[PDB]
Write a protein that holds these residues in place. Structure first.
Motif, PDB file in Angstrom:
ATOM      1  N   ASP A   1       0.812  -1.212   0.000  1.00 32.34           N
ATOM      2  CA  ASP A   1       0.000   0.000   0.000  1.00 32.34           C
ATOM      3  C   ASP A   1       0.848   1.265   0.000  1.00 32.34           C
ATOM      4  N   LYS A   2       2.055   1.209   0.568  1.00 35.64           N
ATOM      5  CA  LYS A   2       2.968   2.343   0.465  1.00 35.64           C
ATOM      6  C   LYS A   2       3.341   2.606  -0.986  1.00 35.64           C
ATOM      7  N   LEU A   3       3.527   1.542  -1.766  1.00 34.80           N
ATOM      8  CA  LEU A   3       3.751   1.706  -3.196  1.00 34.80           C
ATOM      9  C   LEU A   3       2.467   2.092  -3.917  1.00 34.80           C
ATOM     10  N   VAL A   4       1.317   1.636  -3.414  1.00 34.46           N
ATOM     11  CA  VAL A   4       0.041   1.971  -4.038  1.00 34.46           C
ATOM     12  C   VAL A   4      -0.300   3.440  -3.818  1.00 34.46           C
ATOM     13  N   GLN A   5      -0.092   3.944  -2.598  1.00 40.88           N
ATOM     14  CA  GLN A   5      -0.450   5.325  -2.292  1.00 40.88           C
ATOM     15  C   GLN A   5       0.384   6.329  -3.078  1.00 40.88           C
ATOM     16  N   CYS A   6       1.483   5.890  -3.682  1.00 44.25           N
ATOM     17  CA  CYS A   6       2.242   6.764  -4.561  1.00 44.25           C
ATOM     18  C   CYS A   6       1.364   7.195  -5.733  1.00 44.25           C
ATOM     19  N   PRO A   7       1.396   8.468  -6.117  1.00 45.36           N
ATOM     20  CA  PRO A   7       0.549   8.937  -7.220  1.00 45.36           C
ATOM     21  C   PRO A   7       0.863   8.198  -8.508  1.00 45.36           C
ATOM     22  N   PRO A   8      -0.162   7.865  -9.296  1.00 43.10           N
ATOM     23  CA  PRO A   8       0.080   7.127 -10.548  1.00 43.10           C
ATOM     24  C   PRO A   8       1.006   7.846 -11.510  1.00 43.10           C
ATOM     25  N   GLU A   9       1.036   9.181 -11.479  1.00 45.56           N
ATOM     26  CA  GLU A   9       1.875   9.933 -12.405  1.00 45.56           C
ATOM     27  C   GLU A   9       3.356   9.635 -12.217  1.00 45.56           C
ATOM     28  N   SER A  10       3.755   9.150 -11.038  1.00 41.88           N
ATOM     29  CA  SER A  10       5.156   8.818 -10.806  1.00 41.88           C
ATOM     30  C   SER A  10       5.623   7.697 -11.727  1.00 41.88           C
ATOM     31  N   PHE A  11       4.815   6.652 -11.880  1.00 41.22           N
ATOM     32  CA  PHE A  11       5.167   5.556 -12.770  1.00 41.22           C
ATOM     33  C   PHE A  11       4.967   5.961 -14.225  1.00 41.22           C
ATOM     34  N   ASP A  12       5.623   5.226 -15.124  1.00 42.35           N
ATOM     35  CA  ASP A  12       5.492   5.511 -16.548  1.00 42.35           C
ATOM     36  C   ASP A  12       4.372   4.692 -17.179  1.00 42.35           C
ATOM     37  N   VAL A  13       4.289   3.406 -16.841  1.00 43.65           N
ATOM     38  CA  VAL A  13       3.221   2.538 -17.313  1.00 43.65           C
ATOM     39  C   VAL A  13       2.681   1.758 -16.123  1.00 43.65           C
ATOM     40  N   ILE A  14       1.415   1.363 -16.228  1.00 45.44           N
ATOM     41  CA  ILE A  14       0.739   0.605 -15.184  1.00 45.44           C
ATOM     42  C   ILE A  14       0.180  -0.668 -15.796  1.00 45.44           C
ATOM     43  N   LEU A  15       0.435  -1.796 -15.144  1.00 45.43           N
ATOM     44  CA  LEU A  15      -0.140  -3.087 -15.513  1.00 45.43           C
ATOM     45  C   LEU A  15      -1.112  -3.466 -14.398  1.00 45.43           C
ATOM     46  N   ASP A  16      -2.346  -2.980 -14.518  1.00 47.30           N
ATOM     47  CA  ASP A  16      -3.365  -3.144 -13.492  1.00 47.30           C
ATOM     48  C   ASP A  16      -4.311  -4.301 -13.776  1.00 47.30           C
ATOM     49  N   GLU A  17      -4.041  -5.091 -14.806  1.00 49.16           N
ATOM     50  CA  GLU A  17      -4.934  -6.161 -15.216  1.00 49.16           C
ATOM     51  C   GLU A  17      -4.405  -7.508 -14.743  1.00 49.16           C
ATOM     52  N   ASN A  18      -5.303  -8.491 -14.741  1.00 50.15           N
ATOM     53  CA  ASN A  18      -5.020  -9.825 -14.236  1.00 50.15           C
ATOM     54  C   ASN A  18      -4.631 -10.824 -15.311  1.00 50.15           C
ATOM     55  N   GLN A  19      -5.196 -10.708 -16.507  1.00 49.47           N
ATOM     56  CA  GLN A  19      -4.865 -11.630 -17.581  1.00 49.47           C
ATOM     57  C   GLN A  19      -3.418 -11.439 -18.011  1.00 49.47           C
ATOM     58  N   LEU A  20      -2.700 -12.553 -18.159  1.00 50.19           N
ATOM     59  CA  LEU A  20      -1.296 -12.470 -18.546  1.00 50.19           C
ATOM     60  C   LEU A  20      -1.147 -11.962 -19.974  1.00 50.19           C
ATOM     61  N   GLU A  21      -1.882 -12.557 -20.918  1.00 49.84           N
ATOM     62  CA  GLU A  21      -1.722 -12.201 -22.324  1.00 49.84           C
ATOM     63  C   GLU A  21      -2.120 -10.754 -22.584  1.00 49.84           C
ATOM     64  N   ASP A  22      -3.249 -10.317 -22.025  1.00 54.25           N
ATOM     65  CA  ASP A  22      -3.663  -8.929 -22.200  1.00 54.25           C
ATOM     66  C   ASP A  22      -2.657  -7.974 -21.572  1.00 54.25           C
ATOM     67  N   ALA A  23      -2.126  -8.327 -20.399  1.00 56.97           N
ATOM     68  CA  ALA A  23      -1.033  -7.550 -19.824  1.00 56.97           C
ATOM     69  C   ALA A  23       0.242  -7.706 -20.637  1.00 56.97           C
ATOM     70  N   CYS A  24       0.458  -8.892 -21.209  1.00 58.28           N
ATOM     71  CA  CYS A  24       1.667  -9.143 -21.983  1.00 58.28           C
ATOM     72  C   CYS A  24       1.744  -8.230 -23.201  1.00 58.28           C
ATOM     73  N   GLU A  25       0.622  -8.047 -23.905  1.00 57.74           N
ATOM     74  CA  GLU A  25       0.615  -7.147 -25.055  1.00 57.74           C
ATOM     75  C   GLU A  25       0.609  -5.686 -24.623  1.00 57.74           C
ATOM     76  N   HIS A  26       0.137  -5.395 -23.406  1.00 60.21           N
ATOM     77  CA  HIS A  26       0.146  -4.020 -22.911  1.00 60.21           C
ATOM     78  C   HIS A  26       1.565  -3.469 -22.880  1.00 60.21           C
ATOM     79  N   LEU A  27       2.498  -4.237 -22.311  1.00 61.35           N
ATOM     80  CA  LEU A  27       3.894  -3.821 -22.313  1.00 61.35           C
ATOM     81  C   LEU A  27       4.510  -3.944 -23.699  1.00 61.35           C
ATOM     82  N   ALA A  28       4.007  -4.866 -24.526  1.00 67.91           N
ATOM     83  CA  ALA A  28       4.554  -5.039 -25.868  1.00 67.91           C
ATOM     84  C   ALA A  28       4.315  -3.802 -26.720  1.00 67.91           C
ATOM     85  N   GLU A  29       3.056  -3.356 -26.814  1.00 66.43           N
ATOM     86  CA  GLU A  29       2.722  -2.220 -27.662  1.00 66.43           C
ATOM     87  C   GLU A  29       3.400  -0.939 -27.190  1.00 66.43           C
ATOM     88  N   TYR A  30       3.723  -0.841 -25.900  1.00 67.51           N
ATOM     89  CA  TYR A  30       4.425   0.334 -25.398  1.00 67.51           C
ATOM     90  C   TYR A  30       5.899   0.307 -25.790  1.00 67.51           C
TER      91      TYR A  30
END
Lengths: 38, 324, 46, 48, 149
Positions: free
Chosen positions: B286-315
């Motif tokens: 939660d200490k990492l969660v309470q950090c504002p989202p703008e600090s990170f560059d990309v977020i993988l907030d989904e549960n499916q591996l393949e859908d998350a897998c292509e999320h980082l791929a297209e970026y």
């Protein structure tokens, strides 16, 4: 969703169990076949 | 005048010949300045209108006042970027248009206290921090993945390992993976000229761990100059700001579980070994969660591996086509 | 609807990541429409 | 007879669709506000 | 109830019968026997219907507001909002049915006329003053024991 994620990565780590490294792999191999649509 | 036109044509010919040459290095900026509106540039109409938090790529050498650069935007053409000395000069030019800049206020006090500008009114003072307008960063951004709770533990390790495999397989032949067991959070540039330069000094920092941490800092740079994409498998960093003030300034990939409830039972699946260590594995989340989202560059907030897998791929291909 | 809403939110978040370079379902039913209304009226009174 | 048949009865009750009436979300009110106002449209005092 | 308080079914009933009518009928259609008098006056202002100078209230017009008050059908916050909801609501009923006669439509919901006093206005004479009337006795009191003291 998260359980299958770590499960696939755990098999990535895998690459007389010590002598039969394949013995761990047959457990991995037939684990694959069970999942297969065939 | 024929002189300005002649140097204009020479610059265009130099640019045309240098369109297909390797990039020298890259810089990091911290001021929102536009290089297209300045009339002192060698070529007008080919400037750079770049804001802060932006990356510039310098290839060739022009002079001590201006440089030829390119933008990380896709389709960004070759432009001209100011030298670090130039921006310091123009920074003094930004603050001189105002009515007053030194000690003498203009509160109906004209002709009484002339107050000639002392050494305080120039850039010589204010040297307590004096952050440069440019920062040296790798030309190619290294990628660091921040785990859900804590690295070095099973839940995070497979949570990272699967993504590492896909980076190896899909992008094989163009991505190199480097793992650093050593720490990376002690990367400082304004502490001293050379703390612990030699191992024979027997100093506190000479025999400490700062030696290898500093030696691994530039190790990333050569990988970045080789254009082959690299990641940071650092086992010590678990929060975005921990490696944000350093010169790495890397791409931070956030993998997170949607809720703490699923994460707790996710840890339970590993076994009784993680049950000893579970309690502190939730406070790190939660200490990492309470950090504002703008600090990170990309977020993988989904549960499916393949859908998350292509999320980082297209970026990632967008980063490749951005600088190609 | 949760899956549809999450996908739209994710696609919106995808824009920030790329920002560096940048049939018909029948309308509820008599049971559902009435059931939704009672939910509002009970909740409105609370 | 006891369990499956009452699922058939329940399933039809829950999924029954409206009798025509065009679309019926274009109007904001809908609900029961129609029937009360509809009565107010056509009413007459009981002549004594 | 309207049939008895208007035994002849004239279609017009003077308003002194109307308040007694609301007392007789239970909520949400009527005020109810145990309703607070001041709270009962609040709903009377919520009616916001023009008052006929013959003391009468129209049968169709009165039935409309009682429904609107109970079901909170776009009850305006007041002021300019009341000017708009009457324009709005008449358009919904027009949108729902264009078959209804326009004169009859204006009969159920009168076109907004600030000149005509609302149903609240006659009742606002009591409720606002009765709050002050009890205070009026206390207002004269407030100095009175102070004067003695």
């Amino acid at each position: 969703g998260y359980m299958e994620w770590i499960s696939k990565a755990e098999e990535v780590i895998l690459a007389s169990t010590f002598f039969h490294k394949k013995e761990r792999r047959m457990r991995f191999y037939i684990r694959r076949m069970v999942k297969t649509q065939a | 005048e024929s002189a300005r036109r002649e140097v204009e044509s020479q610059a265009q010919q130099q640019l045309e010949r240098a369109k297909h040459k390797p990039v020298a290095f890259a810089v990091r900026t911290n001021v929102s300045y536009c290089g297209v509106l300045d009339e002192e540039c060698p070529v007008q109409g080919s400037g750079v209108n770049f804001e802060a938090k932006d990356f510039l790529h310098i290839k060739e050498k022009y002079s001590n006042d201006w440089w030829i650069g390119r933008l990380v935007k896709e389709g960004g053409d070759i432009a001209f970027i100011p030298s670090p000395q130039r921006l310091e000069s123009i920074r003094l030019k930004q603050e001189q248009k105002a009515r007053r800049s030194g000690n003498p206020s203009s509160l109906s006090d004209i002709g009484n206290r002339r107050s000639p500008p002392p050494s305080l009114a120039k850039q010589k003072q204010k040297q307590a921090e004096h952050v440069p307008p440019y920062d040296v960063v790798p030309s190619m951004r290294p990628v660091v993945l921040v785990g859900p709770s804590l690295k070095g533990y099973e839940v995070t390790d497979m949570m990272q390992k699967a993504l590492f495999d896909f980076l190896k397989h899909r992008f094989d032949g163009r991505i190199s993976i480097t793992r650093v067991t050593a720490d990376l959070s002690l990367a400082k540039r304004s502490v001293l000229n050379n703390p612990g330069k030699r191992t024979i000094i027997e100093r506190s920092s000479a025999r400490s761990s700062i030696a290898e941490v500093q030696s691994e800092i530039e190790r990333i740079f050569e990988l970045a100059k080789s254009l082959q994409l690299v990641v940071l498998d650092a086992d010590t960093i678990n929060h975005p700001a921990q490696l944000a003030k350093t010169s790495l300034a890397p791409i931070i990939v956030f993998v997170k579980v949607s809720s703490p409830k699923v994460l707790q039972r996710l840890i339970r699946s590993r076994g009784k070994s993680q049950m000893k260590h579970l309690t502190v594995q939730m406070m790190a989340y939660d200490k990492l969660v309470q950090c504002p989202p703008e600090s990170f560059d990309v977020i993988l907030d989904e549960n499916q591996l393949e859908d998350a897998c292509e999320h980082l791929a297209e970026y990632l291909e967008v980063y490749w086509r951005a600088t190609h | 609807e949760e899956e549809e809403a999450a996908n739209q939110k994710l696609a919106l978040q995808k824009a920030k990541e790329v920002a560096e370079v940048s049939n018909q379902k029948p309308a509820k039913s008599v049971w559902e429409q009435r059931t939704s209304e009672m939910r509002k009226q009970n909740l409105l009174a609370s | 007879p006891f369990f499956f048949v009452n699922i058939f009865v329940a399933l039809i009750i829950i999924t029954f669709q409206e009798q025509g009436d065009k679309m019926m979300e274009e109007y904001s009110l809908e609900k029961n506000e129609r029937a009360c106002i509809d009565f107010a449209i056509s009413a007459k005092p009981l002549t004594r | 109830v309207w049939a008895e308080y208007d035994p002849a079914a004239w279609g017009r009933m003077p308003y002194l019968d109307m308040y007694q009518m609301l007392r007789h009928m239970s909520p949400p259609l009527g005020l109810g026997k145990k309703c607070p008098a001041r709270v009962a006056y609040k709903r009377l202002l919520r009616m916001d219907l023009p008052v006929a100078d013959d003391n009468t209230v129209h049968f169709n017009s009165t039935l409309m507001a009682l429904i609107r008050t109970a079901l909170d059908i776009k009850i305006a916050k007041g002021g300019a909002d009341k000017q708009q909801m009457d324009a709005e609501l008449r358009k919904e009923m027009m949108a729902i049915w264009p078959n209804l006669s326009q004169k009859t439509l204006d009969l159920l919901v009168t076109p907004h006329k600030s000149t005509d006093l609302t149903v609240g206005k006659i009742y606002a004479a009591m409720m606002i003053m009765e709050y002050y009337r009890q205070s009026k006795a206390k207002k004269l009191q407030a100095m009175r024991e102070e004067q003695d003291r």
